[PDB]
Amino acid sequence: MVGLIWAQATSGVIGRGGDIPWRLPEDQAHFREITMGHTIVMGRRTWDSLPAKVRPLPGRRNVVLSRQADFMASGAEVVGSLEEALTSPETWVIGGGQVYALALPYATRCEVTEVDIGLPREAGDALAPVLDETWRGETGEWRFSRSGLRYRLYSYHRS
Numbered sequence: 001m002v003g004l005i006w007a008q009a010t011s012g013v014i015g016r017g018g019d020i021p022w023r024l025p026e027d028q029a030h031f032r033e034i035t036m037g038h039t040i041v042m043g044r045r046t047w048d049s050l051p052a053k054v055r056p057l058p059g060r061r062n063v064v065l066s067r068q069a070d071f072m073a074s075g076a077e078v079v080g081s082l083e084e085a086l087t088s089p090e091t092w093v094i095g096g097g098q099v100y101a102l103a104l105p106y107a108t109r110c111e112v113t114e115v116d117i118g119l120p121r122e123a124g125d126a127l128a129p130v131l132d133e134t135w136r137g138e139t140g141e142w143r144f145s146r147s148g149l150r151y152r153l154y155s156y157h158r159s
């Protein structure tokens with residue numbers, strides 16, 4: 001099982017400036033719940049976006065994608081290709097825009113949090129992967145985040 005998990009603005013933006021222009025604790029909690037115990041696969045940019053206190057995400061197998069054969073990520077695996085990271089039974093691809101696109105051929109689950117923020121796409125923004133017609137998905141109800149923003153989860157599924 002290879003799944004993808006991300007939050008996005010309505011416009012499709014998922015990152016900007018190497019970080020994320022929002023923070024919803026309710027999605028962090030949901031993120032932790034869905035990934036806990038399993039493999040988490042990230043690109044080197046996303047690993048760098050992670051504070052050193054938080055790194056590696058506890059209780060999970062942290063794997064970094066990087067083309068530098070000597071890149072050190074203390075507490076995680078650094079692999080040169082994505083097939084290396086798919087040896088565990090449940091693997092979740094946690095970003096960013098590059099690795100989401102790499103993993104999409106392997107994926108049958110997309111947990112998408114949609115953040116009600118009007119975030120027009122600027123150059124250099126990272127983006128959610130386009131989901132074609134092979135993906136079926138249940139659209140959740142709008143919820144209120146204590147950060148002021150509304151959000152809703154999409155759960156996309158394919159065979």
Ligand SMILES: NC(=O)C1=CN([C@@H]2O[C@H](COP(=O)(O)OP(=O)(O)OC[C@H]3O[C@@H](n4cnc5c(N)ncnc54)[C@H](OP(=O)(O)O)[C@@H]3O)[C@@H](O)[C@H]2O)C=CC1
Pocket residue numbers: 005006007008013014015016017018019020042043044045046047049065066067068071079080081082094095096097098099100102126
């Ligand atoms: N809203 C959300 O839920 C999420 C948002 N984000 C944000 O989105 C952005 C993510 O960054 P993004 O620009 O997409 O970069 P990535 O996080 O996808 O990392 C790209 C890096 O991964 C390595 N890489 C890319 N392709 C390959 C490949 N085929 N093989 C081996 N290594 C590869 C490279 O490492 P190297 O260059 O060292 O060789 C590359 O620099 C950040 O802003 C982050 O804050 C991150 C995840 C979740």
Ligand SMILES: O=C(O)c1cnn(-c2ccccc2)c1OCCCCc1c[nH]c2ccccc12
Pocket residue numbers: 005006007027028029031032046050051054057058094095
């Ligand atoms: O999971 C944990 O236990 C944990 C512990 N600390 N942080 C954390 C908290 C604030 C800032 C950075 C990390 C955790 O998760 C991140 C949840 C934030 C939203 C998020 C959604 N997708 C992501 C992909 C990559 C990084 C962050 C996210």
